[PDB]
Design a protein around this nucleic acid. Structure first.
Ligand SMILES: Nc1nc2c(ncn2[C@@H]2O[C@@H]3COP(=O)(O)O[C@H]4[C@@H](O)[C@H](n5cnc6c(=O)[nH]c(N)nc65)O[C@@H]4COP(=O)(O)O[C@H]3[C@H]2O)c(=O)[nH]1
Length: 91
RNA sequence: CACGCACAGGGCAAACCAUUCGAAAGAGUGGGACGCAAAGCCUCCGGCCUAAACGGCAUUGCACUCCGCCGUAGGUAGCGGGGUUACCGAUGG
């Protein structure tokens, strides 16, 4: 549970189109601070989950806690501290 | 109608290379020429190739490597059956 710049989210409505998620997560996580990116693959394993990269931890954290169990596309998303740091975060 | 190395006069073009289109398969154009008696034309049937989109299922996945099954949809007529039309006329029991 080491706080991170990026957040893991799952139980995502696998029915909503990639582009749509992208636009609609920014939609509610931008409220918590600038985002450098939101990554999402539609592949068998990476589906149902998105990765949101905030500018700084401070926002991820602020983010996380507030929207846990949050009904998104009639499907309540679990949230967590990304296990690793996205690539650009090195940079 | 069918048949075939009947030498008549022709057609086409595998791999490859260049380039355009497509998610892709693959397709078109250009050089190439493996090999075609229809390797002309047509996707109705079987096979195989691709999964972008569409519908169903499966999946709770910790990624920035790969991304599943069915339907379907496309492609292949140079994978095959089939249909259709065809040049030559050594050959038709
Ligand atoms: N006019 C005519 N003659 C026929 C036919 N069938 C056989 N022949 C004669 O037989 C020769 C060899 O035929 P092949 O074994 O089928 O071997 C053939 C064939 O496989 C190929 N070919 C030529 N033209 C065509 C064509 O229009 N379509 C296809 N699929 N293959 C062809 O080239 C080979 C040699 O061809 P050729 O030099 O012409 O020499 C030919 C030709 O003189 C026919 O339907 N029409």
């Amino acid at each position: 549970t080491r706080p991170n710049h990026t957040i893991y989210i799952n139980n995502l409505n696998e029915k909503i189109k990639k582009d749509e998620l992208k636009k609609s997560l920014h939609a509610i996580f931008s409220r918590f601070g600038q985002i450098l990116d939101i990554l999402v693959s539609r592949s068998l394993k990476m589906r149902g989950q998105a990765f949101v990269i905030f500018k700084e931890v401070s926002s991820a954290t602020n983010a996380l806690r507030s929207m846990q169990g949050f009904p998104f596309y009639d499907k309540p998303m679990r949230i967590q501290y990304a296990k690793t740091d996205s690539d650009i975060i090195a940079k």
